Design a binder for this molecule. Structure first.
Ligand SMILES: *[C@@H]1O[C@H](CO)[C@@H](O[C@@H]2O[C@H](CO)[C@@H](O[C@@H]3O[C@H](CO[C@H]4O[C@H](CO)[C@@H](O)[C@H](O)[C@@H]4O)[C@@H](O)[C@H](O[C@H]4O[C@H](CO)[C@@H](O)[C@H](O)[C@@H]4O)[C@@H]3O)[C@H](O)[C@H]2NC(C)=O)[C@H](O)[C@H]1NC(C)=O
Ligand SMILES: *[C@@H]1O[C@H](CO)[C@@H](O[C@@H]2O[C@H](CO)[C@@H](O[C@@H]3O[C@H](CO)[C@@H](O)[C@H](O)[C@@H]3O)[C@H](O)[C@H]2NC(C)=O)[C@H](O)[C@H]1NC(C)=O
Ligand SMILES: *[C@@H]1O[C@H](CO)[C@@H](O[C@@H]2O[C@H](CO)[C@@H](O[C@@H]3O[C@H](CO)[C@@H](O)[C@H](O)[C@@H]3O)[C@H](O)[C@H]2NC(C)=O)[C@H](O)[C@H]1NC(C)=O
Ligand SMILES: *[C@@H]1O[C@H](CO)[C@@H](O[C@@H]2O[C@H](CO)[C@@H](O)[C@H](O)[C@H]2NC(C)=O)[C@H](O)[C@H]1NC(C)=O
Ligand SMILES: *[C@@H]1O[C@H](CO)[C@@H](O[C@@H]2O[C@H](CO)[C@@H](O)[C@H](O)[C@H]2NC(C)=O)[C@H](O)[C@H]1NC(C)=O
Ligand SMILES: *[C@@H]1O[C@H](CO)[C@@H](O[C@@H]2O[C@H](CO)[C@@H](O)[C@H](O)[C@H]2NC(C)=O)[C@H](O)[C@H]1NC(C)=O
Ligand SMILES: *[C@@H]1O[C@H](CO)[C@@H](O[C@@H]2O[C@H](CO)[C@@H](O)[C@H](O)[C@H]2NC(C)=O)[C@H](O)[C@H]1NC(C)=O
Ligand SMILES: *[C@@H]1O[C@H](CO)[C@@H](O[C@@H]2O[C@H](CO)[C@@H](O)[C@H](O)[C@H]2NC(C)=O)[C@H](O)[C@H]1NC(C)=O
Ligand SMILES: *[C@@H]1O[C@H](CO)[C@@H](O[C@@H]2O[C@H](CO)[C@@H](O)[C@H](O)[C@H]2NC(C)=O)[C@H](O)[C@H]1NC(C)=O
Ligand SMILES: *[C@@H]1O[C@H](CO)[C@@H](O)[C@H](O)[C@H]1NC(C)=O
Ligand SMILES: *[C@@H]1O[C@H](CO)[C@@H](O)[C@H](O)[C@H]1NC(C)=O
Ligand SMILES: *[C@@H]1O[C@H](CO)[C@@H](O)[C@H](O)[C@H]1NC(C)=O
Ligand SMILES: *[C@@H]1O[C@H](CO)[C@@H](O)[C@H](O)[C@H]1NC(C)=O
Ligand SMILES: *[C@@H]1O[C@H](CO)[C@@H](O)[C@H](O)[C@H]1NC(C)=O
Ligand SMILES: *[C@@H]1O[C@H](CO)[C@@H](O)[C@H](O)[C@H]1NC(C)=O
Ligand SMILES: *[C@@H]1O[C@H](CO)[C@@H](O)[C@H](O)[C@H]1NC(C)=O
Ligand SMILES: *[C@@H]1O[C@H](CO)[C@@H](O)[C@H](O)[C@H]1NC(C)=O
Lengths: 316, 171, 172, 318, 171, 317
């Protein structure tokens, strides 16, 4: 005499628990993960230009540590520094090392242009057995160790104008000998002085004589400094001893380049997002792998999982 | 849910409904049957896909940022760097937690709402020829063969054809 | 919308309704007519004005802030200044995007809700004298002149007056 | 013998698209814009006190570059530095230039109080052709170039107590000559030193000799330093050469003052919110004009438009 | 509210209902009475407790942070420290404002919803034996003593027992 | 027949809350989410509170005699009082804020004396500006080296870090006020102090001249620090004006910090400390102070935020 018509909805044997405004755990028929928490463990070589430093820090490649000169004129989107890197040249330090590393890394290039500096009255191309280049003693490829010629060290006063339309990065240094004998035997004068200036900036460094911890046979040091010369400005170098001169300038650029510390191997694959743990997919909006990232990346969050419900309440 | 259909007056879901999210089951003299309602299923699926696409819209592309791990003790500037990164992470973690909570609440509610809408639409179709049994089922007070059931499901049911028989069976 | 009225069982809106957001259209023996419902229109307008006023409430008044453009390469401190500003801008852009998304979803759902409320209120008024035709229209089973329609619209319709006539016409 | 009563809602032929949680574009009858994206291109001189630096940076007006002498004792809510600004005095640099610029900009005043410093045994008010005041040589108006008197430069050792109830800002400097010839001709001693101290802090500077690129005819330089002296504290200046001495102090204030780089013209109008692009209205909650703002301003966002639905879903057709 | 019950077709609340959030009042031949509905009251209370517990979930545990008050004017680094802290405070103040606004909107809507659900469930129980008077009250067209009212309230009301009497009184 | 009415409860007056649409709407019940009050006292549990009383952290670090009561102390939170004062040799610390921060974060003043050999100089110099008991004295952790006899040789000493933790060395440079003082103490007319590791170096040249009179002295000491990592070496090379270290502080990592506050300490339990005192952490937000320590509610600008915990309150129509 009749019939029954029932309305209903689907269900599944086992759904997924999600959180809502009112519930920390409520079961829905389906959900999807919003947090990327896994990585292949490898850095993909595409689409970004990856430069593996292997045994070299960015600063050692910049200065021209001989075993790092394979990186001359190199470029990168991401420079990868390995924990196995080591220095093998003259022992040095960089005041504000972090800033120099940062600005070179962001520039993205080690493009070096040699310039014809005239060092009248001094001996050029000083070398050291702490920095062997081949079988013989050597020095940083981008620096010029100036010492006395004969029995005198004159007041060096040289200039280099920037007639180009880009910024020039000059890396230079100051030699701190360990003994007064060393100081006078190298630069005659008992107290050196190095002044590097542009129209709008100036730096004057006085070397400091004294023993430092023994490093690769040496208790002397070199201190590295840098000077940016803008288009239309002029570099002037004025020293009466202890100058570690530049051989030219690095070409400054602006762009998407950076640097990363990671021991993850590089592989031939595609991935927009790199972390020190490896490349990760960027389909999810969040990630828990590493707060250090490069590229188009999910935002880092503390949660290791966040389920977005993609189905109704599951009522089996 | 806000509308009281799913996990409400619909006592439970159908694990046997594998071809739709919502649908009809019927028993008449010709037997029993089941059919998915494509329109409500697609309404729910379209809303959930749109919400999902909005959630995964953009990966932000950053390149050179600040350092976030440190091997030496430095003090003030490193304190500021760490505090900035901590603050950013806490704020974004909050955003993610709240986003998922709001989205999931709204998803449950809209799926519940689509169920209720289908129920309501069917009752309005049936007019005075049926009664709401209070459990998501309609008692139809006239002979309703498979073609009549299909006419209900596809929106072409003419209630006037059956109104006299139905009214006599009801009252 | 959540309530299935707007873009739901009410097939479309009325471009002809120019003096209200919601209202009635009727056909009776005296002809056809249209009238705005003031109460539901004002309820919707008041809620939307309230949410708009909350959205535009307050100015952040700041004065001396950090530098945000730089003419020289500096490294660490300038990196931190830029990162702080980028982080702030991204967080506020997210806040703004989410705010309009939530607000707009809620506005659509509440307008839909007001429509559904007016519909249910009318049906409850009509009691057993009418039937829901499934498209937002009620079939009224009795003679209902313009005064009777207006009594429905202004909430003074007495269903008992017409109940016998209607029950006769419905279940014949 | 019946009637029909229909319920409905309005619609318009074409509405506006907005975004929701589920939809990138859905049509509603009305919406309002929440992002301010336009500017008049001009900075309104009210209600904030705008000071146009014209050819002068804030630091050059602070030091007293001659072509900046018009800014003496000036005050501002917003100091506007123009890209056409230039220096025209003794070539100088400021270690942490940004900090001095920021703290002076925040102070909001260049009010300068001259104090009677006694510089026993030295020649005062040295001048230079790199810093002409009129046709003749000059120097920064707020600094005092001390040099030898006769054939000696004695050890300057002076004190200045702060018996007021406000902070004093002292600007001073150190002269870096280009040759030892110059160093000894100016200050006798072959190596100078400048030590400026309060009870709990001190700054010690050693001059730097060497040839630098010529700027307005000079290879020498000056480095600028500053010292804040609190109520009850005392300033002590001790130098044996190369001191560019202070003539007094700037009065430190706290308040809403700041600085902005902009080439936008000033105008006679009222606007609470200024950007380098000009003044903008602040009725909307967000803005896309410039992340650099001053005043009560909408929050900066990346979006150039955000539509808030102010009407129902627009459904003119089935 | 979204569902039109609380401050809607229910014209006002009952200050006399002191043992529940929702309930029934009845008038029958045995007199008048009132009783709280435990299930809907408990549903609303559980949802509100759940959202309250989610809001109270985690304290951020921080230890060494940056300095936030300063006794000397320093300039650039202190400017950055102050700006970071002000930005953080503004972002979290916004989060708090938006959180309570969304939560309170939702709380009003879900309590309105529970009221509406209880009403619809009762109406479905009564089948053809009652009519909705439009003010949250049902006119029941048959003799319904205290046990019958209780059977409605505890969900065991059998509409067939009274259907003939009720239909006769209705039409 | 019969009538069955459905309804909801109400109260005469509820609480006003805010919503998306409303600045004020009345609900039956609400709870406060902003902690805006404090007892005014810092609870001594569960965190290890160290009250500096009269001593800043730096003065306790250096060993100002009236602060030596803090030797080898540890803390979760070091509380510096505004009444603190210095009572030793007048000094300044370049980057004072950083040293204070890193010591506070380390959480310990644990000091290990090392056998430095200072050949050819007089050790343990003292001053009346820094009395230890009835006689003149000096900072407990520093060693004032001066000439021995009539010469001050070039000191060149080394100290390797063969441990597995970082060593913090605090040292100093003396700036005399006169050339007479400089030569009477260190022979050489201009001293120099160079402290170096394998990867870093600091060289300080003193500056002779008068500074403001403090406790009888117009000279100063400048304080510096050097961290030596495991496997690294400290090397000290000076030809005058060296204020030598006596050993190293042990560096730790953990939850320790420092706070400026004049609130008294009390016997109570509270996870969250502010300079105003301890506050409960049951609420998610707080308006007491942006400076906090421990598991704390997040600081917000609002002094009140009401979360609805009941339905809309509708007593009248
Ligand atoms: C470079 O220039 C600076 C600045 O002028 C000079 O530094 C001043 O040196 C003098 C002398 O050393 C200092 O004067 C000393 O003041 C002490 C503090 O005084 C106060 O406290 C008492 C107690 O209530 C009050 O009554 C008084 O009004 C002050 O408020 C005094 O205690 C000292 O007096 C004792 O010593 C002197 C001399 O030994 C005796 O005559 C006294 O009777 C008493 O025994 C003394 O008066 C002054 O404070 C320094 N000023 C600053 C700013 O540092 C340098 O001396 C100068 N350098 C060189 C090399 O010349
Ligand atoms: C100042 O003191 C330091 C530390 O005592 C002296 O440095 C030390 O100098 C000796 C002399 O060469 C170094 O010895 C060498 O060590 C290597 C590595 O073990 C060994 O293979 C060589 O055969 C040689 O013996 C020692 O390493 C070095 N130590 C440090 C920490 O640097 C320095 O010479 C003193 N300076 C003066 C001017 O006296
Ligand atoms: C050390 O080298 C620098 C750089 O070469 C020398 O600076 C130069 O000094 C000369 C000498 O006056 C300047 O000549 C001038 O040129 C201008 C051109 O505008 C002219 O108008 C003047 O009449 C004068 O002839 C030259 O400009 C300047 N160059 C730079 C780049 O600074 C400096 O003189 C050298 N020092 C020593 C001690 O040799
Ligand atoms: C939850 O949703 C996902 C995504 O739509 C479903 O996974 C897909 O299922 C289809 C159907 O067999 C497959 O063809 C696809 O390959 C699956 N995609 C992925 C990414 O796995 C999943 O089946 C859904 N879960 C339930 C229980 O319905
Ligand atoms: C490193 O890079 C620079 C820049 O590309 C090289 O300089 C260029 O050399 C080529 C070849 O002679 C010229 O055509 C360009 O005009 C030069 N550019 C500039 C800016 O000088 C430089 O030769 C490279 N060095 C090495 C060793 O390859
Ligand atoms: C990615 O690498 C980082 C660092 O190598 C990992 O983070 C460390 O995880 C270990 C093991 O739990 C902890 O002891 C360290 O404290 C973590 N360091 C930091 C800075 O968090 C991280 O687990 C790795 N993640 C993945 C997915 O591989
Ligand atoms: C809706 O369902 C009805 C019932 O099945 C369909 O109507 C019948 O269709 C069959 C097959 O085409 C015909 O043989 C019958 O004569 C039809 N009967 C009636 C009463 O129409 C109808 O075609 C369906 N409509 C849609 C749009 O799917
Ligand atoms: C306000 O001024 C800023 C700065 O001049 C403008 O931003 C620049 O816009 C140009 C063209 O779109 C870009 O090439 C630059 O990269 C932008 N600079 C920065 C710092 O973002 C901005 O467009 C102006 N806004 C308005 C509304 O006029
Ligand atoms: C907690 O202490 C802080 C700082 O001592 C108080 O903040 C100060 O309040 C006074 C008066 O309300 C203002 O004049 C100061 O400008 C405030 N200083 C800062 C840094 O905000 C705060 O009011 C105290 N709170 C409580 C609850 O006692
Ligand atoms: C409602 O409309 C009727 C006309 O049908 C009129 O008589 C009555 O006065 C109206 N009531 C109100 C309150 O407007
Ligand atoms: C409104 O106009 C747009 C074009 O701007 C069109 O895409 C859309 O379909 C129109 N909507 C209606 C309802 O006509
Ligand atoms: C649309 O909204 C704006 C702002 O709320 C208002 O000024 C305008 O009058 C509205 N337009 C219509 C047609 O309602
Ligand atoms: C600047 O102001 C001070 C105090 O008002 C006054 O003594 C001084 O003479 C003023 N200088 C000028 C140039 O107006
Ligand atoms: C419901 O109420 C009826 C009438 O009072 C009673 O007989 C029955 O036992 C009750 N059932 C339940 C489950 O409470
Ligand atoms: C409740 O009290 C407030 C005063 O605090 C008053 O403004 C409000 O009107 C009262 N509400 C009712 C319903 O009486
Ligand atoms: C109001 O809420 C508070 C906190 O949730 C609770 O302690 C109190 O009992 C509530 N009052 C009522 C009448 O429910
Ligand atoms: C301080 O602590 C260290 C190790 O905790 C210990 O070697 C040293 O002797 C202690 N100092 C004193 C004075 O007890």
């Amino acid at each position: 005499p009749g019939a029954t018509l029932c309305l209903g909805h689907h269900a599944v044997p086992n759904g997924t628990l999600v959180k809502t405004i009112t519930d920390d755990q409520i079961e829905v028929t389906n959900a999807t993960e919003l947090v990327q928490s896994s990585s292949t463990g490898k850095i993909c070589n595409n689409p970004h230009r990856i430069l593996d430093g292997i045994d070299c820090t960015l600063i050692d490649a910049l200065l021209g540590d001989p075993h790092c000169d394979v990186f001359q004129n190199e470029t990168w989107d991401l420079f990868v520094e390995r924990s196995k890197a080591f220095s093998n040249c003259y022992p040095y330090d960089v005041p504000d090392y972090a800033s120099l590393r940062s600005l070179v890394a962001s520039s993205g290039t080690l493009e070096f242009i040699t310039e014809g500096f005239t060092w009248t009255g001094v001996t050029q191309n000083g070398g050291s057995n702490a920095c062997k280049r081949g079988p013989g003693s050597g020095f940083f490829s981008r620096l010029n160790w100036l010492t006395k010629s004969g029995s005198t060290y004159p007041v060096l006063n040289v200039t280099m104008p920037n007639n180009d339309n880009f910024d020039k990065l000059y890396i230079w240094g100051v030699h701190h000998p360990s003994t007064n004998q060393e100081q006078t035997s190298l630069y005659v004068q008992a107290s050196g002085r190095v002044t590097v200036s542009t129209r709008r900036s100036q730096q004057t460094i006085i070397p400091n004589i004294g023993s430092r911890p023994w490093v690769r046979g040496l208790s002397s040091r070199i201190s590295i400094y840098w000077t940016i010369v803008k288009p239309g400005d002029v570099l002037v170098i004025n020293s009466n001893g202890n100058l570690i001169a530049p051989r030219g300038y690095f070409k400054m650029r602006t762009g998407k380049s950076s640097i990363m510390r990671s021991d993850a191997p590089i592989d031939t694959c595609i991935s927009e997002c790199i972390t020190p743990n490896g490349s990760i997919p960027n389909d999810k909006p969040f990630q828990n792998v590493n707060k250090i990232t490069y590229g188009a990346c999910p935002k880092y969050v503390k949660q290791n999982t966040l389920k977005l419900a993609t189905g109704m309440r599951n009522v089996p | 849910g806000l509308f009281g259909a799913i996990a409400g007056f619909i006592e439970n879901g159908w694990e046997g409904m594998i071809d739709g999210w919502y649908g009809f089951r019927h028993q008449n003299s010709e037997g029993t049957g089941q059919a998915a309602d494509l329109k409500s299923t697609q309404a729910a699926i379209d809303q959930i896909n749109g919400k999902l696409n909005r959630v995964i819209e953009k990966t932000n592309e950053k390149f050179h940022q600040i350092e976030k791990e440190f091997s030496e003790v430095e003090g003030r500037i490193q304190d500021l760097e760490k505090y900035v990164e901590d603050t950013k992470i806490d704020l974004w973690s909050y955003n993610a937690e709240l986003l998922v909570a709001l989205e999931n609440q709204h998803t449950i509610d809209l799926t519940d709402s689509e169920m209720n809408k289908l129920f309501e639409k069917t009752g309005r179709q049936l007019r005075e020829n049926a009664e709401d049994m209070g459990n998501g089922c309609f008692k139809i007070y006239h002979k309703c063969d498979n073609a009549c059931i299909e006419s209900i499901r596809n929106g072409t049911y003419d209630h006037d054809v059956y109104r006299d028989e139905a009214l006599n069976n009801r009252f």
